[PDB]
């Protein structure tokens, strides 16, 4: 999956790059402050496998399966 991967927790990442290996679900987390951007698994995209790996909790991780679907446009209802 090709998604944007930033070196820091910014709220406007625009660097498109292929996702590392062992990654089939793009992840777009938003802890009301920083829009995390990283390649995540579809099995680890639950309400415990992400808030634990990042060592956080209050956040809305949204996994996707489209070349670049973790952008900042899928968490504003
Ligand atoms: C992500 O990687 C792809 C590499 O795709 C390869 O080429 C495809 C045509 C297909 O054969 C895949 O199975 C291959 O793995 C990048 O796409 C190519 O990248 C090369 C080198 O950068 C470039 O010369 C080609 O023209 C590109 N072709 C296409 C269709 O993209 C792609 O750009 C990478 N994306 C990012 C954000 O890095």
């Amino acid at each position: 999956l090709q998604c944007y991967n930033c070196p820091n927790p910014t709220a406007d990442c625009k660097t498109a790059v292929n996702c590392s290996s062992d990654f089939d679900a793009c992840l777009i987390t938003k802890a009301g402050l920083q829009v995390y951007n990283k390649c995540w698994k579809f099995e680890h995209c639950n309400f415990n496998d992400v808030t634990t790996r990042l060592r956080e909790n209050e956040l809305t991780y949204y996994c996707c399966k489209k070349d670049l679907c973790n952008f900042n446009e899928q968490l504003e209802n």
Side-chain angles (χ1 to χ4, degrees):
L1 244 77
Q2 306 173 238
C3 269
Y4 313 87
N5 200 288
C6 258
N8 254 349
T10 184
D12 268 316
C13 196
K14 234 145 135 162
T15 183
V17 55
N18 276 278
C19 260
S20 227
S21 302
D22 290 53
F23 285 126
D24 263 61
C26 282
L27 174 100
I28 163 64
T29 287
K30 223 233 123 175
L33 251 145
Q34 298 186 140
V35 172
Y36 281 90
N37 272 335
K38 35 252 305 123
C39 303
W40 209 277
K41 302 244 63 232
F42 189 62
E43 217 63 57
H44 299 187
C45 234
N46 32 106
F47 229 126
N48 209 74
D49 269 61
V50 174
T51 45
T52 308
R53 262 239 92 189
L54 307 165
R55 320 128 93 59
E56 230 161 329
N57 232 255
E58 268 263 357
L59 74 91
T60 35
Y61 72 84
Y62 179 80
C63 255
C64 213
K65 297 137 291 134
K66 238 214 220 128
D67 296 330
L68 313 158
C69 178
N70 136 98
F71 39 67
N72 63 352
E73 177 234 64
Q74 219 111 317
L75 275 138
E76 247 279 42
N77 72 290

